[PDB]
Subunit: 252 residues, 2 copies
């Protein structure tokens, strides 16, 4: 069936066996340490684990946070984040999401991104635009006197500056779903010059975003290009416009 | 009905009326200007009314954000934020909450904080303890590494300094609902030294962090003592502890 229907299913299953778990930070514990270095906790595992029960039978290429990479030598590669911003979930903060990115010959094909608590699907096919539960969505018409951002900078960003330029901070704790807060026009921007965010985190939204006007820009100014491993941290500046980028560029 | 039976009821009303408004940016118009200078959107007003629809039958004090201070000389004041975080609400940020606080002779009695998205009920009676939908929730316990604060600071507030100590930053845009996150034990602290937070935003939850181990402190380390009004934009420090409080109290 369609990548679309394949992701929404996987989503709805994840959502099934783990939402009860939501916030219950006591029934969780570390189970392993992901290839990325990070510590893998159990509800992460049981999600990914629930995810490979579908992608395994499709013998497509695979890449996720916990598992790493399973190369079946295929045209296609399904990149998954069982939970985007685990923590938030384990600590009852209603900001996490399922990240599902499908790639054809390293080319953004389809992209799903599910926000459990809001019951919201962020899905976008390369070439066909971006939708929120079926409604077309694009970036926000920029405006200097109202910009609202998020960010996870380095020890080399004049905080006071940005805060003197930006009219509203809103840090959240799940890049992937934050990007989507850009595609649907709620934030002028979200970056991350602290090389921590990985492939898996942004992948699915990398797409979606782009189809709704995103300027996924790398540390310099260039179009953020990336790889498809479980490892490899990376910079990134999802902006809603060619000025909003700049501002980050000046701060940067 | 006890107080909490009223509180919890007034919320389920509000829920059914403003949930379909969540993110519906196109569906709401300003209707006036609240005492604190803020603007009252209709999702604001409409829910405020729903509060006054119950409490008016009763001969007590009413202190709510858009309306201000309806006073009936009783020794029973009722303080409510119809929606704590109008912004987030109407822009599809899943971080808002209902605030129902009650004090007898200017002293805490019952406080409620409803966060509709998570469906969590934050309540506390004075001396009887603070829970979340039954299960007793209690503050954290200082960790020198894992500091997870949220904040709304001033220019003077050294920022690189602060971020040098806090191991996790978040800023959800609704100080009221955020305090309860100090309640349940998620955040190690949370301030606003840029006096915008008012009575109405932190009353109802005031009673809960109090009744759950948090310290509450004006900028000068001193046990916060507010008045019961619409106007008046105060400073405030809701903290995990003292080692923390110490931390916060020095960065500024
Ligand atoms: Zn992780
Ligand atoms: Zn994750
Ligand atoms: Zn992630
Ligand atoms: Zn307001
Ligand atoms: Zn309000
Ligand atoms: Zn408020």
């Amino acid at each position: 069936m369609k990548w679309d229907e394949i992701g929404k299913n996987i989503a709805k299953e994840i959502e099934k066996e783990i939402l009860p778990y939501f916030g219950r930070k006591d029934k969780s514990y570390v189970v392993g340490t992901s290839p990325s270095g990070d510590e893998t906790e159990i509800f992460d595992k049981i999600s990914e684990d629930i995810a490979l029960k579908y992608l395994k039978s499709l013998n497509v290429n695979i890449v996720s946070e916990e598992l790493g990479v399973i190369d079946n030598s295929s045209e296609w590669t399904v990149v998954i984040d069982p939970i985007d911003g685990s923590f938030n979930f384990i600590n009852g903060i209603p900001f996490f999401a399922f990240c599902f990115g499908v790639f054809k010959n390293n080319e953004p094909y389809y992209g799903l991104t599910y926000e459990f608590l809001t019951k919201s699907f962020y899905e976008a096919y390369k070439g066909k635009g971006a939708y929120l539960n079926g409604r077309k969505i694009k970036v926000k018409d920029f405006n200097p006197n109202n910009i609202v951002i998020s960010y996870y900078p380095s020890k080399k960003i004049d905080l006071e500056k940005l805060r003197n330029k930006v009219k509203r901070v809103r840090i959240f704790g799940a890049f992937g779903l934050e990007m989507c807060y850009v595609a649907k026009g709620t934030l002028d921007a979200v970056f991350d010059v602290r090389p921590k965010v990985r492939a898996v985190d942004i992948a699915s939204s990398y797409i979606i975003c782009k189809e709704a006007g995103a300027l996924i820009t790398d540390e310099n100014g260039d179009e953020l290009k990336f790889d498809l491993n479980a490892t490899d941290r990376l910079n990134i500046i999802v902006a809603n416009s060619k000025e909003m980028l700049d501002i980050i560029l000046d701060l940067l």
